Design an enzyme around this catalytic site. Structure first.
Site, PDB file in Angstrom:
ATOM      1  N   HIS A 174      32.161  42.697  54.725  1.00  0.00           N
ATOM      2  CA  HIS A 174      30.850  43.376  54.634  1.00  0.00           C
ATOM      3  C   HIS A 174      30.517  44.164  55.909  1.00  0.00           C
ATOM      4  O   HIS A 174      30.738  43.655  57.013  1.00  0.00           O
ATOM      5  CB  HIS A 174      29.748  42.346  54.363  1.00  0.00           C
ATOM      6  CG  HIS A 174      28.424  42.991  54.165  1.00  0.00           C
ATOM      7  ND1 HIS A 174      28.102  43.656  52.992  1.00  0.00           N
ATOM      8  CD2 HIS A 174      27.382  43.145  55.012  1.00  0.00           C
ATOM      9  CE1 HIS A 174      26.888  44.160  53.121  1.00  0.00           C
ATOM     10  NE2 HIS A 174      26.436  43.861  54.346  1.00  0.00           N
ATOM     11  N   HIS A 229      32.747  46.945  52.444  1.00  0.00           N
ATOM     12  CA  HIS A 229      32.927  46.980  50.981  1.00  0.00           C
ATOM     13  C   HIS A 229      32.638  48.398  50.486  1.00  0.00           C
ATOM     14  O   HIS A 229      31.722  49.041  51.038  1.00  0.00           O
ATOM     15  CB  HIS A 229      31.951  45.984  50.346  1.00  0.00           C
ATOM     16  CG  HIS A 229      32.093  44.599  50.866  1.00  0.00           C
ATOM     17  ND1 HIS A 229      31.009  43.792  51.115  1.00  0.00           N
ATOM     18  CD2 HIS A 229      33.191  43.870  51.160  1.00  0.00           C
ATOM     19  CE1 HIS A 229      31.448  42.606  51.518  1.00  0.00           C
ATOM     20  NE2 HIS A 229      32.778  42.638  51.569  1.00  0.00           N
ATOM     21  N   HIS A 246      18.096  43.841  47.026  1.00  0.00           N
ATOM     22  CA  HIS A 246      18.049  42.446  47.524  1.00  0.00           C
ATOM     23  C   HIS A 246      16.675  42.138  48.136  1.00  0.00           C
ATOM     24  O   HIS A 246      15.934  43.084  48.475  1.00  0.00           O
ATOM     25  CB  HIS A 246      19.216  42.219  48.483  1.00  0.00           C
ATOM     26  CG  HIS A 246      20.532  42.100  47.792  1.00  0.00           C
ATOM     27  ND1 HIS A 246      21.035  40.879  47.376  1.00  0.00           N
ATOM     28  CD2 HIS A 246      21.451  43.031  47.450  1.00  0.00           C
ATOM     29  CE1 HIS A 246      22.217  41.073  46.803  1.00  0.00           C
ATOM     30  NE2 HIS A 246      22.502  42.391  46.840  1.00  0.00           N
ATOM     31  N   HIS A 299      29.710  42.039  46.214  1.00  0.00           N
ATOM     32  CA  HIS A 299      29.752  43.483  46.561  1.00  0.00           C
ATOM     33  C   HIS A 299      31.074  44.070  46.041  1.00  0.00           C
ATOM     34  O   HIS A 299      32.111  43.401  46.156  1.00  0.00           O
ATOM     35  CB  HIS A 299      29.573  43.676  48.074  1.00  0.00           C
ATOM     36  CG  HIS A 299      28.254  43.219  48.603  1.00  0.00           C
ATOM     37  ND1 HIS A 299      27.961  43.218  49.961  1.00  0.00           N
ATOM     38  CD2 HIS A 299      27.155  42.750  47.979  1.00  0.00           C
ATOM     39  CE1 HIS A 299      26.739  42.768  50.145  1.00  0.00           C
ATOM     40  NE2 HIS A 299      26.226  42.462  48.952  1.00  0.00           N
ATOM     41  N   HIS A 311      27.600  46.018  43.227  1.00  0.00           N
ATOM     42  CA  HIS A 311      28.310  44.746  42.953  1.00  0.00           C
ATOM     43  C   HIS A 311      29.366  45.022  41.886  1.00  0.00           C
ATOM     44  O   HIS A 311      29.228  46.031  41.177  1.00  0.00           O
ATOM     45  CB  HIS A 311      27.298  43.672  42.526  1.00  0.00           C
ATOM     46  CG  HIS A 311      26.399  43.233  43.632  1.00  0.00           C
ATOM     47  ND1 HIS A 311      26.353  41.930  44.068  1.00  0.00           N
ATOM     48  CD2 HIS A 311      25.546  43.914  44.418  1.00  0.00           C
ATOM     49  CE1 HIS A 311      25.478  41.823  45.040  1.00  0.00           C
ATOM     50  NE2 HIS A 311      24.965  43.017  45.268  1.00  0.00           N
ATOM     51  N   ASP A 348      28.958  48.837  49.869  1.00  0.00           N
ATOM     52  CA  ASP A 348      28.015  48.613  50.996  1.00  0.00           C
ATOM     53  C   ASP A 348      27.224  49.897  51.248  1.00  0.00           C
ATOM     54  O   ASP A 348      27.702  50.757  52.013  1.00  0.00           O
ATOM     55  CB  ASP A 348      28.728  48.099  52.245  1.00  0.00           C
ATOM     56  CG  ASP A 348      29.210  46.663  52.124  1.00  0.00           C
ATOM     57  OD1 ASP A 348      28.634  45.914  51.279  1.00  0.00           O
ATOM     58  OD2 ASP A 348      30.179  46.305  52.869  1.00  0.00           O
ATOM     59  N   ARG A 391      18.723  38.538  44.505  1.00  0.00           N
ATOM     60  CA  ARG A 391      18.837  39.814  43.761  1.00  0.00           C
ATOM     61  C   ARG A 391      17.529  40.037  42.999  1.00  0.00           C
ATOM     62  O   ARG A 391      17.308  39.339  42.015  1.00  0.00           O
ATOM     63  CB  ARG A 391      20.070  39.740  42.869  1.00  0.00           C
ATOM     64  CG  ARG A 391      21.321  39.359  43.642  1.00  0.00           C
ATOM     65  CD  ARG A 391      22.519  39.139  42.748  1.00  0.00           C
ATOM     66  NE  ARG A 391      23.660  38.605  43.478  1.00  0.00           N
ATOM     67  CZ  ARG A 391      24.933  38.748  43.125  1.00  0.00           C
ATOM     68  NH1 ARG A 391      25.270  39.407  42.030  1.00  0.00           N
ATOM     69  NH2 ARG A 391      25.880  38.221  43.870  1.00  0.00           N
ATOM     70  N   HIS A 401      23.203  47.532  47.271  1.00  0.00           N
ATOM     71  CA  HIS A 401      24.672  47.404  47.127  1.00  0.00           C
ATOM     72  C   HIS A 401      25.113  47.626  45.683  1.00  0.00           C
ATOM     73  O   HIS A 401      24.406  47.219  44.728  1.00  0.00           O
ATOM     74  CB  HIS A 401      25.158  46.033  47.603  1.00  0.00           C
ATOM     75  CG  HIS A 401      24.525  45.535  48.848  1.00  0.00           C
ATOM     76  ND1 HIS A 401      23.653  44.483  48.837  1.00  0.00           N
ATOM     77  CD2 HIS A 401      24.643  45.920  50.138  1.00  0.00           C
ATOM     78  CE1 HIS A 401      23.254  44.228  50.076  1.00  0.00           C
ATOM     79  NE2 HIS A 401      23.846  45.098  50.892  1.00  0.00           N
TER      80      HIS A 401
HETATM   81 ZN   LIG Z   1      29.133  44.075  51.286  1.00  0.00          ZN
END
Ligand SMILES: [Zn+2]
Ligand SMILES: O=C(Nc1ccccc1)c1ccccc1[SeH]
Ligand SMILES: O=C(Nc1ccccc1)c1ccccc1[SeH]
Ligand SMILES: [Zn+2]
Lengths: 153, 153
Positions: free
Chosen positions: B71, B80, B120, B63, B48, B83, B143, B46
């Site tokens: 999401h 997002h 992640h 995100h 962020h 995403d 993370r 993702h």
């Molecule tokens: Zn997301």
């Protein structure tokens, strides 16, 4: 209103956090924060062209130079956009940074977001060393710590 | 044509380099590179909101979500901008990344320059985990590594 931040890391012990803030697009950028683990005295302090850390701070390329000018101090007409001059580390090895610059920006074609802030081994001679390297890098030596300049809360 | 790059670093062994290329404005973005030190299987992947590494990957924020959506997977209408779904670590712990996304950009409103890429600990459930966490993070957990998205040569 535009808030950006940069975390300086390198191989060695030099690390720091530098904030940037610009209220008006055409107006000055306040640059402030702390850097620890430095040798006492002046250290070259520059925005380099690339937000590229693939081979460490070397991948960052030269001082950000969109107008193809020669290296100078921040006060000179003839400088790189990225020429922020020197920061000064006290005997404990901490440089308290507080700069205003009107050549760097956080918007437009001189925007430094996604580029690299570098703190160097030694003094930037500000283009007054009388050799080829003076009017390119200011003879500030190796790149101790760097980071990509990114958008903050 | 715009070229950007991201180096993923964390507290553990996950390391990688991710390239982004966009040939025309609001055109698709090619995302490709390699991540190693990953557990075999799916890892949430993702952009962020914040290019802020002051407190490690935690200060990246959520995100990147400029349109204030829930999401989802990259193929969902409800997602997002950040995403990008999952990448797959083979049995050696290497994720060869190759993604094409048209929601992220390297120019304009959906621009990820100076934001943070995060890989992640776990699979992104793409919003189908049947809890609050699924509709915010996809339950991708911690993370493992992140980097600020910077301008490349
Ligand atoms: Zn997301
Ligand atoms: O804002 C940017 N360009 C830009 C260029 C011309 C006019 C207005 C804006 C930009 C592009 C990439 C990274 C960071 C910034 Se600030
Ligand atoms: O693109 C930017 N500004 C911008 C300004 C005018 C038109 C289109 C775009 C930008 C700003 C900050 C970070 C990254 C980008 Se790409
Ligand atoms: Zn210079």
């Amino acid at each position: 209103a535009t808030k950006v931040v940069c975390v300086l890391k390198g191989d060695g012990p030099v690390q720091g956090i530098i904030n940037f803030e610009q209220k008006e697009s055409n107006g000055p950028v306040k640059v402030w924060g702390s850097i620890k683990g430095l040798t006492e005295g002046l250290h070259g302090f520059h925005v380099h062209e690339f937000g590229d850390n693939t081979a460490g701070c070397t991948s960052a390329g030269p001082h950000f130079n969109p107008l193809s000018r020669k290296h100078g101090g921040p006060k000179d007409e003839e400088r790189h956009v990225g020429d922020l001059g020197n920061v000064t580390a006290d005997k404990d090895g901490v440089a308290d940074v507080s700069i205003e610059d009107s050549v760097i920006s956080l918007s437009g074609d001189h925007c430094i977001i996604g580029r690299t802030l570098v703190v160097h081994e030694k003094a930037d001679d500000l283009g007054k060393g009388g050799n080829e390297e003076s009017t390119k890098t200011g003879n500030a030596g190796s790149r101790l710590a760097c980071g990509v300049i990114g958008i903050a809360q």
